[PDB]
Amino acid sequence: RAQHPNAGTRFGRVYNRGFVRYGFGGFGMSVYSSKKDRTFKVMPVPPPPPATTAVEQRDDFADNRGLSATTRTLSPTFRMFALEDGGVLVSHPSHAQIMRWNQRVHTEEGKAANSTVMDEYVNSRIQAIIADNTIENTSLSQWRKAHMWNVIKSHGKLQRRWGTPDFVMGARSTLYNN
Amino acid sequence: QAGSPRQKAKLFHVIPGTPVTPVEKLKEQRRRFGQDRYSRQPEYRPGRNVRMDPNTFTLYATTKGVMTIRTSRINPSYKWLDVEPDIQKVYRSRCMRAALQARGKASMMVAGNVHYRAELDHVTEPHWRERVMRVPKATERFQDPNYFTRGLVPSLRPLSRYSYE
RNA sequence: AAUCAAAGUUAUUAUUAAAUAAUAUUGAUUUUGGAUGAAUUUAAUUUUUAAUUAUAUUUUUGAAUUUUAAUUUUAUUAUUUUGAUUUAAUAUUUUUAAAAUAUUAUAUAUUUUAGAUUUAAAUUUGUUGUUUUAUAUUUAGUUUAAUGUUUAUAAAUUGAUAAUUAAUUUGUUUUAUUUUAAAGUUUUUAUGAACUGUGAUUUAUAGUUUAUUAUUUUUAGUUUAAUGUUUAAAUAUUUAACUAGUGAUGGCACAGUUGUUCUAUAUGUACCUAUAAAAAAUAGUAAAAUUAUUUUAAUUAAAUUAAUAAAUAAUUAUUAAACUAAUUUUAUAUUAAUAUUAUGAAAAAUUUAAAAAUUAAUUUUUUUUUCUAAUUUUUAUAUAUUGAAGUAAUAUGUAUUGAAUUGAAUAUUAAAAAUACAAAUUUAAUUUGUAAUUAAUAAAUAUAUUUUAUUUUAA
RNA sequence: AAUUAUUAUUAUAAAUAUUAUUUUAAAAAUAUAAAAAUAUUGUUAAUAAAAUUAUCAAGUUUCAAAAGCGUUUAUUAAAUGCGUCGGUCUAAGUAUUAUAUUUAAGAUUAUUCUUGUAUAUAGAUUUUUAUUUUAAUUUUAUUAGUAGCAUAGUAAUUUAUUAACUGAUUAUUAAAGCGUUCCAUAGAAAAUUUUAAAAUUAUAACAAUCUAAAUAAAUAAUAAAUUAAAAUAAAAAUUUUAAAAAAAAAAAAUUAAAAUAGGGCAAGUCCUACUCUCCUUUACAAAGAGAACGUUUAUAUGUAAUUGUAUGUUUGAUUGGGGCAAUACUAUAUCUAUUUAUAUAGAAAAAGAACUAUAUUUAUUGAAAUAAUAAAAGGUUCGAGCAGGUUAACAAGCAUUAAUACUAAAUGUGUUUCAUCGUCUACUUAUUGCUAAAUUAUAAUUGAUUGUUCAUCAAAAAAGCAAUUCGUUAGUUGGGUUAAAAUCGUUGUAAAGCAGAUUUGUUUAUAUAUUUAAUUUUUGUAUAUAGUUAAAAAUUAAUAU
């Protein structure tokens, strides 16, 4: 055995993920192929609205048009003004003026034949938003259901572990991982 | 069937074109003893101020000066090693030739140009092929020995018959 | 059903160890002989219980080495009368012995689920995590001096005599060390003949076939087989075979370069490589190890040689260096001095070789502070419209040749003609009969673009 | 004997003691076998020496090969042993004797010829063959001969068997048996014939003893696991990983179900052997002592001598310094030649010079398996190679790695292969493996397979034959020669004591035929003659909430 530094990988050899792919050459290893990429790929674009402008609404890579052609619904309410700095001051109807509007559209949605037992349910949740802002989203629910427990462990010092001096709080705070 | 030894490296021990001391082996040639028989013809025959060692066919310069290879005009396979003794004579021109051609004021038809030598000779001596191709009759190659005693020909050289140009 | 992460204190008792110290010493653990001695004998000109201040010589060329230090002068073999002093070490036993958090159709501990996975060390001679070690807890577990302050001074040379205009340091004399564990061995003497050899040792406790005192044989301990396989056994249970010993399990006798051997290199106390004892043999030349996180300058090399790798280049390393034209106002790891148990380079580009890889080749050859930002995406285009099948007697001619025969369609021969139809099917030959050099445009991309794994910041 | 264990410690003596340690409600294996129809070797490498029995426990016969009856650590043409014979010995033992050997008794015979040891020898070596030792290469006559006989082989013939790799016979040039040969030959190991109880194939067939639980509490092994399955690709390897994609008790398929054997290589040591290396060496010879004997020398060097060498590289040849082959060179492919052999002692004494070594050049012979070994890794049986089968497709001497031999038994499996549609043969010889060939008619081909079972083969000084060796020994052939642990994980078969009920979908050890008859249509077709079916035969049924 010729044990010389610079004769191979300096101390032994390790297979970190930046190696098992992108090996010497970028192909890169013969074994340890790699993990399949199980991320969340973004979804493809919706179709644009029909043209009926004759302004060449069809052209994609033109200077005038921003790519997105989203003339959706109460967008005319989002009437924007030109500031001084070059910014924009978009005046939109508040989150209540919309849910209160949505109730109107929805309450006259199912009433034609018979508002279903779920249709009565939605207008309640809608009429529950204007009044109380009864929130329905995970990002707060995932936060609130936890943040409460985390802060109550503080007010009532239910630690059981008072030492935890950032060496023992070293593993923790990184054995968790967000 | 047998074994074999490794072929040694017989290559230049200076940089051609650059100055040279005498204790430097200019080139360590293959005394091409085909296989240790006694007849060889070295690649780089000796030139001006260069003297060949008899045993190992290595050219050692005889006076310190810039060195160069003169490829024979007839056959570009047979080269000499010229050492021209004056190092300032070429340095103080190179520093010009390379300062002129920087300002774009030097001509590329120079004799020292590598790719021009084929045409350079032909601008001056237009029939030099015929001056070396000409076969001499055995009469003129041994000019009348009486012309040597009568003193007409300064000295008869009967063996120097080959035009090495 | 399934998980669930989990208890650091016994309690109680007091004069050894190790080195050291330069005063004693006829063999430590009952009362010899107990007839009267013959029986209680360890001594000799050799590195020895005697332990020696140099680097020059000289030397099988290579493990060989320096002579009184003061003549009896103190370097000399050592304890009770400070728990004898000192410094290092520190216990050992008795009986102690403990505990309440994460699912509900399953990848692996974080409470908010999902994301997440070499267990390490070696070994990788990149045959690139190459089939090796580790159950766990604690204890024990490996020796190259990182330093030069006043008395004080060094420094070369011939082969040899000698010569030394030859140019010059440093040093109150610096030495000592050199890994760790591990063989088979190997030599030096002590123990063993209760096992077992062989020497020697017993002169008639059952059955039986045959004329026979010889001879077939009852034959429960032994040439086989099953079981057993850390077994009840480091050889036993059951069983086959054998069994006739006036010539032999046996008084004591031979002992290790050797005894014994009806000889198998067998055994001589449960592996004969005898035991026992005393060494530091060798083991770097692919054995196992070699103990201290948070760092602060990089790299490979591939040649001379080898009764085939401790040695050399080259590399790497430790320490140290000086700014020679070439350019930008760019950009540059070049060296010295020492330390060095190494022979073979992925994917290519090619080149030897039945290679069926080896060989040459020559560029690779990964150590993530934390929050964040980002331009390389297990999503690309695949060959058909048309079984053109009606439309007409002939005529050099069934050419010639070869042929049993051949008439365009046996065989060979193929540029003859004229009023167009000789590379076939068909028939033993012909005629009939199929056939009559035609519409059938895939080309016109389809999405191009956008949008995704590494080009930054802030702390 | 590690114990309160297998265990009458057999020196003796005796013969009627109602002397006193053994859990328990089951079927699997297994140790084991009472009982019981046929069959008799078709099982197997091979049946037959294979426990006891009141049903009283015994196979007979022929041929070939084979001695003594003792004796042995892998148990026998091992080694003993009597006789004969060769040699030695008349101042320690009886010369028809005892030493020292080679053979083997009994019966026939015991051939041809010599190059060396030994003897004799004459200063010694060198020479030198009455007998002896060893030899005979075409000794090879007698004699047996395919035989434990180097291949060639299953020898060619004959038998024998349905089938003859058996075995026996004839002869007979046997790779190189051979006079210590050959015959004769008994219990042995074969080959027949034949009979036969072991549960030999067929064939499966629990009577017996060997619970759970309660109690006591050991062992191998142990990096971890929540992954482990399963399928597929891989890349260095057997696959294991990686990845993708899925989704209690028995058995031994995997993990190391194994131990430990089997290799071959490296450095180290061991042990044995002989013409070539070398001491301590006790013998031979010389000399010296008026030789009274013991010592010391000199010259000699003995395998009796126990030291060390016996290589290295590519595989068996090569070792040098050059050159051509892209100013690459494994030895690649070719060739050349005063291309030179450094040092040290000797040799040359002025400046000049000789000798020799794997020609970088350190050591003082060459060989062995010794059951070789110890510390290591690494292969014979392979994700790739090589040489000898009809020429060519195929057995298979080098790149991995406790996978730890071929075959058989049992037991599976995924493939693939024409028209339904397809794959169950059993035997003989040899256990080599695969064919030959007998049963009317005769087994598809690949692949992964065997720690469960044997051991037949292959196999480790126990021998022996021919064969190579100066020997130690080496390689064919035959007889011998332990083959093994409490099952933890996976895995799978079952089970969880439950149930008034099979079943929606998962998923399937489970599937009608491949030892051929008789019908019936034998007419259609043409020289013989088909085709659905049926009966019989191969005799058995299968449901987790």
Ligand SMILES: [Mg+2]
């Ligand atoms: Mg410790």
